[PDB]
Write a structure and sequence with these properties.
The protein is built from no helices and 3 strands. By secondary structure, it is an all-beta fold. Residues 5-37 form the WW domain. It comes from Homo sapiens (Human).
């Protein structure tokens, strides 16, 4: 049930070990959980 696009207002970043994380600019949340999953 994977999404085809990142939701509006979100950005991907990568931590030093190469693990992605996700920022939600409009709720000011930073999470390891991919919102498309």
């Amino acid at each position: 049930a994977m999404g085809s696009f990142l939701p509006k207002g979100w950005e991907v970043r990568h931590a030093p070990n190469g693990r992605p994380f996700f920022i939600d600019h409009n709720t000011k949340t930073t999470t390891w959980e991919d919102p498309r999953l």
